[PDB]
Design a protein around this ligand. Structure first.
Ligand SMILES: CCCCCCCC/C=C\CCCCCCCC(=O)OC[C@H](O)CO
Ligand SMILES: CCCCCCCC/C=C\CCCCCCCC(=O)OC[C@H](O)CO
Ligand SMILES: CCCCCCCC/C=C\CCCCCCCC(=O)OC[C@H](O)CO
Ligand SMILES: CCCCCCCC/C=C\CCCCCCCC(=O)OC[C@H](O)CO
Ligand SMILES: CCCCCCCC/C=C\CCCCCCCC(=O)OC[C@H](O)CO
Ligand SMILES: CCCCCCCC/C=C\CCCCCCCC(=O)OC[C@H](O)CO
Ligand SMILES: CCCCCCCC/C=C\CCCCCCCC(=O)OC[C@H](O)CO
Ligand SMILES: CCCCCCCC/C=C\CCCCCCCC(=O)OC[C@H](O)CO
Ligand SMILES: CCCCCCCC/C=C\CCCCCCCC(=O)OC[C@H](O)CO
Ligand SMILES: CCCCCCCC/C=C\CCCCCCCC(=O)OC[C@H](O)CO
Ligand SMILES: *C(=S)NCCCCCCCCCCCCC
Length: 520
């Protein structure tokens, strides 16, 4: 049998005990997670962060476990996504005290994405006396935890631990089970290293712990660089245009026309290529009222035997009066199709509780928007006879959602505007998650940005071609259409999710099961 409590005199009990020291370690532990992500990319920190949290929950009761999970999550988001403050301050025009209070509220609320599972772990799931089962149960809890984060309210799938393995040794597992399997193995390892000393007395158990600990790592390295997809056709020559049109939230007539003339003038001279791509809302005019600018741009592409792909605000006139808006992208030239954004950022593209909050937002002079969600099932964009999966801005962040469109495609395309966050680590984290989509999908991704990290991503998630951010530039490069299905795109989460459900159900039942001192 095993208690698990560290022997007295080791200076390690405060970690797993109720009180402020254990919470402060958890706060710092959570703050490691951005370190393991881009741009720092110290991926072993991801294991340490989770290992520290797992250890800090060992003896803990439910009420203090909940708050210790809140402190961990507060450190993760307070350090990992605090960069959201830049958009609110610099482009929302809010003062620093105001913007600080908003971000303080946000990360304190978002920190409950780690508080709730911690509380669930303590009250119902944790088995301190079974080291091997506890590690599996914790890993399977980590999956549920991130899966829940993708779904709840609108979802905030930021800082998944799995993204640290994009260029890490576990990159071989990402095409197999997605970012989900990557997070699962990082948590599983982290709990095994904690409980590994407890298996030293026992040979067979320790051996089994070592296979579970290092087996998947070996499997990830063995599968690193393996191509599950095959060439579908001749390479496409791609030109992406990055015009640092200063974001003006008050959108004014004289700067609009200079946008239309900037993107045109930059496209014409480019010697013939297969694809011209423009970033998010590259043409600022509504789709219906830009027939002239759009129509001319198609013939310019036609003379260049090319397809032009650009983001454009799209309007829908209802039967009664006023319109409805969408953040769309459309294709002209050698191609067709128009895609409408489905995932909308709350408080950026729309107001989630507009009736109460509208007046409140207005008194503090905060920007508001009224974009609407795209339909459930939309066709893919067509360009030179190929199926191009479209992603606008942070739709790339939702892995299950991305996989549905990534399948049934031969190339991946995203246009996004990272201007809002400036020189912070947001755009790099955002970009990193875009590369994971290429690695899960075994497809090339074209990423054109209004100003931040435009590039071409090979099917291994590696950035083969890119241009400097924060300056006007053009990216010339070649991407290859891809055929075939990765295992992750074939089966998605369900194989791993079912395994996790079993492990959670086992732990839940096994925690309360009589250990062969049966009453019957
Ligand atoms: C003591 C138990 C033994 C275990 C080993 C020691 C554990 C503590 C080690 C490091 C935590 C301190 C890290 C401080 C928090 C990370 C720094 C940070 O958050 O920087 C992110 C930055 O804000 C992005 O812009
Ligand atoms: C910085 C916070 C200090 C707290 C740490 C105290 C205990 C360290 C625990 C485990 C090893 C983590 C150290 C790993 C060093 C970084 C990993 C690395 O070398 O990555 C290279 C980089 O990713 C190329 O881009
Ligand atoms: C979801 C968005 C958040 C909505 C609200 C979520 C729950 C808020 C509960 C209390 C708020 C004020 C907390 C006051 C501090 C509570 C301290 C406490 O309970 O400590 C117990 C101790 O840790 C055990 O030993
Ligand atoms: C509740 C307060 C909601 C705060 C709204 C968020 C916000 O103002 O964001 C500005 C944005 O950056 C403009 O582009
Ligand atoms: C370990 C402690 C973790 C918690 C930390 C505090 C969390 C409090 C919440 C919001 C603070 C609002 C201020 C956020 C300031 C971030 C500013 C920022 O990241 O800007 C990047 C800059 O542009 C790069 O050049
Ligand atoms: C929407 C966003 C609204 C978030 C508002 C409030 C959450 C405040 C939660 C902070 C509570 C921390 C309590 C704590 O740290 O516990 C003390 C410890 O137990 C002592 O022994
Ligand atoms: C469990 C832990 C989650 C706690 C809430 C997390 C962050 C709140 C931060 C404020 C963000 C509020 C905007 C999100 C929202 O309200 O979205 C509504 C959506 O329409 C629904 O269908
Ligand atoms: C392959 C992956 C290798 C990467 C390892 C990097 C960081 C691991 C940090 C793990 C920290 C382990 C702490 C050990 C511990 O705390 O053991 C306590 C135990 O309960 C005593 O009986
Ligand atoms: C107290 C609780 C406070 C809750 C609100 C706090 C932060 C959310 C602010 C919204 C996040 C920033 C929205 C602006 C933005 O990100 O712009 C992206 C653009 O819309 C895409 O193209
Ligand atoms: C599905 C149910 C999983 C089977 C649970 C069996 C179990 O948890 O037993 C553990 C331990 O032997 C209890 O003494
Ligand atoms: C294009 S949309 N890129 C912008 C990325 C914005 C990141 C900000 C995310 C804020 C989401 C909060 C939702 C809260 C859910 C509970």
């Amino acid at each position: 049998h095993s208690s698990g409590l560290v022997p007295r005199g080791s200076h390690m009990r405060w970690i797993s005990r109720p009180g402020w020291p254990g919470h402060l370690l958890a706060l710092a532990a959570g703050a490691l997670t951005p370190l393991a992500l881009a741009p720092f990319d110290y991926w072993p920190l991801a294991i340490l962060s989770i290992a520290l949290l797992y250890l800090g929950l060992r003896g803990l009761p439910g009420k203090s476990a909940l708050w210790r999970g809140w402190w961990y999550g507060f450190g993760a988001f307070g350090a990992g996504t605090s960069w959201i403050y830049v958009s609110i301050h610099d482009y929302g025009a809010a003062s620093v005290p105001l913007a600080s209070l908003l971000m303080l509220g946000f990360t304190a609320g978002v920190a409950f994405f780690f508080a709730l599972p911690a509380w669930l772990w303590a009250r119902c799931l944790r088995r301190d006396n079974a080291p091997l089962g506890d590690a599996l149960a914790f890993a399977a809890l980590w999956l549920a935890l991130e899966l829940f984060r993708s779904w709840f309210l609108t979802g905030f799938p930021w800082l998944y631990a799995g993204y640290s393995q994009l260029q890490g040794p576990l990159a071989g597992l990402v095409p197999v089970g997605g970012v989900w399997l990557s997070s699962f193995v990082i948590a599983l390892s982290a709990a095994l290293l904690v409980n590994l000393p407890r298996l030293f007395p026992h040979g067979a158990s320790l051996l089994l712990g070592l296979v579970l600990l290092l087996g998947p790592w070996a499997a990830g390295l063995y599968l690193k660089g393996h191509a599950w997809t095959h060439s579908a056709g001749e390479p496409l020559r791609v030109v992406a245009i990055q015009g640092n049109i200063a974001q003006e939230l008050k959108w004014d007539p004289n700067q609009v026309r200079a946008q239309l003339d900037l993107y045109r003038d930059l496209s014409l001279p480019q010697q013939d290529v297969d694809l011209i791509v423009w970033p998010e809302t590259a043409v600022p005019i509504l789709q219906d009222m830009a027939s002239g600018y759009l129509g001319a741009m198609g013939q310019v592409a036609d003379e260049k035997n090319a397809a032009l792909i650009t983001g454009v605000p799209v309007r829908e006139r209802l039967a009664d009066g006023k319109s409805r808006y969408f953040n769309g992208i459309t294709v002209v030239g050698e191609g067709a199709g128009t895609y409408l954004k489905q995932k909308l950022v709350p408080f950026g593209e729309y107001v989630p509780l507009q009736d109460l909050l509208r007046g409140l937002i207005a008194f503090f002079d905060l920007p508001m928007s009224d974009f609407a969600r795209g339909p459930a099932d939309q066709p893919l964009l067509k360009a030179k006879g190929y199926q191009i999966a479209p992603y606008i801005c942070y739709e790339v962040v939702y892995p299950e959602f991305a996989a549905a469109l990534a399948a049934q495609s031969q190339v991946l395309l995203t246009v996004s505007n990272d201007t809002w966050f400036g020189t912070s680590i947001g755009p790099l984290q955002h970009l990193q998650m875009a590369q994971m989509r290429a690695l899960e999908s075994g497809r090339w991704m074209i990423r054109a940005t209004n100003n931040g990290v435009t590039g071409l991503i090979d099917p291994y998630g590696r950035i083969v071609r890119q241009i400097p951010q924060f300056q006007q530039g053009i990216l010339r490069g070649e991407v290859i259409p891809m055929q075939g299905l990765t295992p992750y795109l074939q089966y998605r989460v369900w194989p791993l999710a079912g395994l996790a459900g079993v492990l959670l159900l086992w732990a839940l039942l096994g925690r309360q099961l009589r250990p062969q001192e049966r009453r019957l």
